[PDB]
Structure 1
C-alpha cells in the first residue's frame, strides 16, 4: 500500500508496510491510519552492531503522522526488536541555481526547499516529541563543524536513549556531526 518514489519497493520497505498494514487492520489507532502513508524506509548501523530504521513520510502527512507518532513508534519498536524508529518527512532539495545551467525552473527556488532549510527540518523531525531549545555550531581547530543541539528537559529520560541514533541518522542523511544535550537552564 506504500507509495514508493523509486518505483520498486525493497524487502525492508515492504516489511514496514506490512507492519503498518497490521496496525491498520488490528490496533488501537486504526481510525487514523487510513489516509496515512509512507514513501520510503531504510535501515542503517548507528554504532557498534545496533541498527535503526528511518521512515520517510510525505510532507503534507507529516503533521498527521506526528500526532500519533508517539503511539506508533512504540508498536514499531516492539515489532522490530531492538531497532530504533524515526519518522522524517520526505523533503526534496533543489540545487542552488548557477549562471551555468539551463531552464531548470522558470520560478525561484522556494526557501523551504534549500539545503540548509531541509537539513534544519530534518533535525527538527528527527526529534519529534522533544523540541529543540537551542543550537550551537562548534568549529574545531581543523575547521570541522560540530553541531550541538539542546532539547527539552521535560523529555530527558524518555529520549536520552534515542540519542546516539539521532546522531547516526543525521550523519547518514546530511553528513553533519551532531550532538544532543539537555541544558539545566529552562
Structure 2
C-alpha cells in the first residue's frame, strides 16, 4: 500500500509487514498530516554478528529531508512496536559503472562509487554526524576505516555502533570502527 517499488514486480513479505506497521502507525497517531506521500522503497534484514539482528529501510532520495525531521520518533516507534531490534534508514542510490573505452551522457560524479559510499555512511549516522575519518592499512594490505563521531548527542547512539558496522559491511563491504574522541568538544 504505502510501499512503492521502482520495478513493476511483487514485493516480499518482510517489507510488506513493515509497510503495514507504519501505515497503522500513521493512521493511529499524530503523523497523518506529515506522512501522506511519504513512501518506502524496500526493506531488508540481516544477521548482525552477536545475538541480534537489524532492519535496513530504503528511502527515495527526495524523501530524505522529510524523514530527517521525523527520524527521532520513527526509530522509537519501530523499537516499541518490535521487540529488541534497532532500525536504520538508508537512501537508495544508483551506481553507474566506469565508462571504459571497451564499451551516451556523461556520468555525474554523485553516482560514482566513492560518492555513493560516503553518502551511505553519512546517512547511516543521522543523530551524530561525521567530524573526522581515518583510514588504517593493516599488515596484510587491507584497509580499516576509523570514523570519529561528535560528543553532543551520544546518549542514543553509544550502543548502536555494532549494528552500524554490521550494516556497513553488509551493504558496502568495508571494515569500519566508530569512536568518540576528545579533541574539540
Report the TM-score range of the alignment, normalised by the length of the smaller protein: over 0.9
TM-score by length of 2: 0.94
In structure 2, the CA distance between the partners of 1:141 and 1:6, relative to structure 1 (3 Å rule), is farther
Conservation of the 8 A alpha-carbon contact between 1:3 and 1:37: no
> Does 3-12 or 58-67 show the bigger shift?
3-12
> Does 175-184 or 2-11 show the bigger shift?
2-11
| Deviations, residues 54-99 of structure 1 (Å, cap 9, x unaligned) | 0000011111111101111110111111111000001111111111
Q: Which contiguous aligned blocks of 4+ residues in structure 1 show a shift greater than 4 angstroms?
A: none
Conservation of the 8 A alpha-carbon contact between 1:42 and 1:53: yes
Q: Distance in 2 between matches of 1:69 and 1:92?
A: 23
Conservation of the 8 A alpha-carbon contact between 1:4 and 1:40: no
In structure 2, the CA distance between the partners of 1:4 and 1:49, relative to structure 1 (3 Å rule), is farther
| Deviations, residues 107-164 of structure 1 (Å, cap 9, x unaligned) | 1111111110000000001001111100001111111111011111012221011110
Unaligned runs of 5+ in 1: none
- How many residue pairs were aligned? 182
Q: CA RMSD in A?
A: 1.2
Residue 182 of structure 1 aligns with which residue? Answer: 180
Residue 47 of structure 1 aligns with which residue? Answer: 49
Q: Distance in 1 between matches of 2:120 and 2:19?
A: 22
Flag the structure with higher strand content. 1
